[PDB]
Design a protein around this nucleic acid. Structure first.
Ligand SMILES: Cc1cc2c(cc1C)N(C[C@H](O)[C@H](O)[C@H](O)COP(=O)(O)OP(=O)(O)OC[C@H]1O[C@@H](n3cnc4c(N)ncnc43)[C@H](O)[C@@H]1O)c1[nH]c(=O)[nH]c(=O)c1N2
Length: 455
DNA sequence: ATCGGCTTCGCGCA
DNA sequence: TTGCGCGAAGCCGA
């Protein structure tokens, strides 16, 4: 389906390899990008090669994301050579490195997947300028190409959802089988990059790592076994138990989908054919279909996705009007980060975020709204809630991150509610509201250990 | 074209 | 808990 490609640059198709510049979608199956690279490599009797660019951004988050990512690449690499596609791994800025790699190996054609974040689009430009062969983009990450789904920033779910469903019958389709190439250190990069990151690993008073790395096992292989678990054990109770922090009825797929270790489209396919509770199947389909992809919609059509300016006008006008309110408490980053607020429900969730790297969905909503209530300005609430989300979430640094922080503190894709001190018309949430929805003390007590335990 | 109808709200009440 | 009505509130879209 040609609608999944955009022509970034046009030109002289080299007598050489087709180059997949892998970035978002780190999987070898279920990958429209690797499929397109392999299509036009067959139309030219050239091999297809894969190149990944490892960049200095790993220092801005934690060992947890980097071991999750790097382990997934060790397994993609052997999985990619079993079908005769060599994987190449460059360490440097994709501005210069991908550029050089193009000239150096005589690439016939270049291809990349699609991120809507600002920095991938800075790179793509530095790539287009220092390059002579054609340059192609494929949305391998959304069921419906970001730029076809809609042509504007979408105001709400219920306005984006019809456009999306109207296009679902044509892009919800099976994946062809990736045919292997006809014509014919990462251990070490994992070593250095953890050495450089070990001085900042989150520790306990007894020098122990806070992080528990057994809750999510990385890779394509482990990814698919988590979807199969979810469809067989959890999908049915999803409508009813998804909002109860005390049960793991979440799919648990976000760390894998973030790193593109599983296609969102293979999951939809496999939910769609499964015979579960309708309400479960609907609730679930609109998270992974609508909300995931309005988040790409958000970050694409809004360059300042991660700042106050991108809130809707009414919530900008609201929070401004309450900047001069006395705040009940005020915390610093350090105080939040170590869960030293006055709110054991708040502090429990921050403990869940540090030791697992995935905080319960429903709780992240409460977490983010309390940052706005108990910090000195909204801009500073944004800053903390981004800092902590990207530092400690396994699925962080993600359009779902930005659009969800935005949802919580700024009202993006939300509506106006009853006007309050500090938080204005932004949707309010309370401990007492939690108490009627789920057994807070069970939550709190699962994590009440790790408080005194941390320094 | 004006009017439901809006992710995940809180709260009383049975 | 567990469900329902009602509240406050800005705006898109057929
Ligand atoms: C403050 C805050 C911070 C974040 C987020 C929300 C909030 C309120 N989210 C979005 C959401 O909280 C997160 O995707 C889910 O908790 C992922 O958990 P499961 O995969 O178990 O979801 P679950 O199995 O319930 O849902 C299925 C899938 O749908 C998608 N999805 C679900 N809820 C979504 C939402 N609210 N927005 C967008 N997509 C959603 C995800 O891909 C998720 O994997 C996010 N998400 C993320 O992937 N990375 C992040 O760093 C953040 N950050």
């Amino acid at each position: 389906n040609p609608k999944r490609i955009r022509a970034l640059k046009s030109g002289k198709q080299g007598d050489g390899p087709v180059v997949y510049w892998m970035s978002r979608d780190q999987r070898a199956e279920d990958n429209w990008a690797l499929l397109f690279s392999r299509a036009i490599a067959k139309e030219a009797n050239v091999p297809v090669v894969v190149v990944f660019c490892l960049t200095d951004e790993f220092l801005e988050a934690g060992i947890r994301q980097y071991e999750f990512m790097l382990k997934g690449l060790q397994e993609l690499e052997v999985s990619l050579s079993r079908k005769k596609i060599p994987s190449f791994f460059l360490r440097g800025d994709p501005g210069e490195k991908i550029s050089r790699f193009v000239k150096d190996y005589n690439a016939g054609t270049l291809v990349t997947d699609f991120s809507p974040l600002r920095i991938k689009n800075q790179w793509i430009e530095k790539v287009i300028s220092g390059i002579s062969i054609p340059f192609f983009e494929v949305d391998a990450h959304n069921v419906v190409p970001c730029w076809e789904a809609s042509q504007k920033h979408e105001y709400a779910a219920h306005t984006f959802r019809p456009k999306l469903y109207a296009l679902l019958p044509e892009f919800l389709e099976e994946f062809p089988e990736l045919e292997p190439n006809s014509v014919t250190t990462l251990s070490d990069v994992l070593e250095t990059g953890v050495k450089a990151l070990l001085p900042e690993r989150a520790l306990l008073k007894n020098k122990d790592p806070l992080f528990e790395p057994w809750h999510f096992e990385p890779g394509e292989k482990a990814a698919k076994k988590v979807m199969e678990s979810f469809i067989a054990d959890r999908l049915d109770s999803y409508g009813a138990l998804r909002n109860d922090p005390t049960k793991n009825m979440l799919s648990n797929l976000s760390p894998y989908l973030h790193f593109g270790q599983i296609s969102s489209q293979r999951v939809v396919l496999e939910v769609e054919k499964a015979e579960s509770n309708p309400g479960s199947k609907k609730a679930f389909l609109d998270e992974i279909l609508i909300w995931k992809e309005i988040s790409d919609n958000f970050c694409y059509y809004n360059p300042g996705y991660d700042g106050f300016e991108s809130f809707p006008s009414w919530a900008k006008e609201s929070l401004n009007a309450h900047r001069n309110d006395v705040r009940s408490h005020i915390y610093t980053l350090e105080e939040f980060e170590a869960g030293k607020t006055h709110d054991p429900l708040w502090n429990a969730s921050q403990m869940e975020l540090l030791s697992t790297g995935k905080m319960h969905g429903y709780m992240r909503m409460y977490w983010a709204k309390k940052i706005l209530e108990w910090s000195e300005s909204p801009e500073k609430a944004l800053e903390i809630a981004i800092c902590l989300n990207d530092r400690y979430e396994l699925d962080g640094r993600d359009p779902n991150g930005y659009a969800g922080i935005a949802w919580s503190i700024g009202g993006v894709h939300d509506r106006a509610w009853g006007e309050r001190e500090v938080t204005g018309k932004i949707r309010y949430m309370s401990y007492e509201g939690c108490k009627r929805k789920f057994d807070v003390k069970l939550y709190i007590e699962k994590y009440s250990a790790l408080d005194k335990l941390a320094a």
